[PDB]
């Protein structure tokens, strides 16, 4: 099979995304890229993550055309895609539904400077303007959202997290989660003090 | 046995409702409708979901007559029969006893188009009026309730789900749960943006 | 051993309250009554709950009085034993720390009838003002705050829940501690809708 | 291999951690005080918990030098060394990362008397300004907001509870997170109840 590490990983983290809470059901989706080869490995559509084998994952191509692999690519695989034809800092994206930041997005606000783990994605966490789940304007607005960062929230939907690996693209997608319920539950009852521009370059 | 098929799902989903933090105790309850024999099966009542074989399973005729079975069928059987009666696009049933679908019930709030995923269910989930547990009342509030969606909240109470088959149906219950968990988590902090009732059609 | 049944209860009761979140540490505990006998069951002082065994829970008679047993009984023994003398309905008890009943509880307010589970405890759960960790006054201040109830909360500390046995009074604790979720949870965004006097003798 | 039984120890809270809840990832780190030979034994850098052997623990001596081991130590060491050359009482610390300590922490906050449990640390737990991360001044700043308590928030970040031995530190740092979600939850719907400065000398 073609780039069978990186499926045996999409697989791993897939549980590991269920099993942190970061999604419910089968949705959500990972992504990793070779870099080499040009093409992008990706989590199937639908399937539960403890009953995903890595011949489940999909093989594509950057135009979104299936090289290898007979189930169907998730749904969600525009929003993947554009990430690795217009950045080269990105070889792992990790899409998730988790509630905190499902939260802020909802609301359609940034998420500041609350944390320094605020810092795995930037000086702070951008919201992108809803458009249709599964479509091309979806991924326009996620990249946009996510420039000169490592994650964007989706509004009323969820967040993408991507980085150099799969391993620091699932930290990033979890401490952000953790950091919109930090900010989340500081809203709730008060004004958190937040990190300077400073010293989030700092960090 | 009858309608084993249905049995073995209904213990395996009760299960997975127990786990997925969807009901407390034995509470809350599994219909699967054979449309083919118009017979239902249902969870026991009482049982602990781990507990229960698909032999404890019981199965009814459409009006509510035990066909097959030992155990007493959950006390909130005729909420299920109603939708068996008199829908036919509902072949299964997941009722909930679950916390955030529960809060937006006791404040006898609708709850409207905060995610995407509200369109599991239609372009909102309604509240039936509170009636008491056990009874025809409730299942005609509920059903009423439902009407053109697939779930609907119960005032003081929790969730009931319906759809063309048992995964569906536990899908609408688990992600309706996750919506509410998202307007009730917003709603602490500010006011969510909505999505758009064309937006819930094209969806 | 004396009570063996019993005791073998309060092992597998004492893992269900701390895998059920209903407890931090080795925190809160369980008793049981032999009504035959006049003999207490208890739960062992500060043994973790996956490490206890039958032999480690200690048995009392109503003066307090260790009859058998090489463990230091429960330090809220005191609180345990006033429910054996003073009421003859009660012959288990399961004391909480939990986290919803106890933020109620440490807002000194009453649990009123949010939900219909509210009635398995009665219409409505009492606060009993904060008194002294294992001392007779808490026992006392308990005690009289469940006068007609099968649970109360205990300010700034947590809740005890009674029944007939065992099975029940864990459902007590486990279903108004979910009530109690409710309450704060709503109470975060609104007012709850609250079920009627009547309708809660009903049930 | 020196410090054998803290090394083992330092493995088996960690998993305790992430398992209760009280870590993302692999951040927050544990130490124990070897006092008779002046070593400190402390959670390597980065590992993910249950991944983590007694092998790997890092051996320092009180200048921060590594004795024994080949992993990068903690890379919050110098937080760690200060108690343990400042103080003769803290033998073992628990730093966690974990959601209500820090909630109340990055609003700035004190967390009062809101439960008997708070005696854990003391009559109260100050929140230590923010300090950047892995750095001699976050490590004046905590202990400075610790003196004469077993726990201190540190703002935008965390909790760090010490104690005589590893399970008394673990403990103080599990209850103190679960007197942190108290205050959190009464804050967001009323005013708590707070216990008066001599009960908490009794206590
Ligand atoms: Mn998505
Ligand atoms: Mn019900
Ligand atoms: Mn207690
Ligand atoms: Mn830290």
Redesign the interface.
Known sequence: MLLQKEREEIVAYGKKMISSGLT??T?GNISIFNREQGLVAISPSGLEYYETKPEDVVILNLDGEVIEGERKPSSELDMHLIYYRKREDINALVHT?S??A??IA????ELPA????IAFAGPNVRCAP?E??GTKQLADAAFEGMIDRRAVLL???GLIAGANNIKMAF?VA??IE?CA??Y??????????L?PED?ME??
Not at 106 to 109: F, T
Not at 114 to 117: A, E, G, M, N
Request: aromatic share 16%.
């Open positions: 419910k059901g949705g539904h509630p905190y499902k939260t909802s609301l359609g606000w609350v944390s320094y783990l809803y249709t789940f509004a009323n939907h930290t979890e401490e953790f319920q930090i989340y539950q500081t809203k709730s009852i008060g004004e958190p003090k990190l010293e700092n960090l």
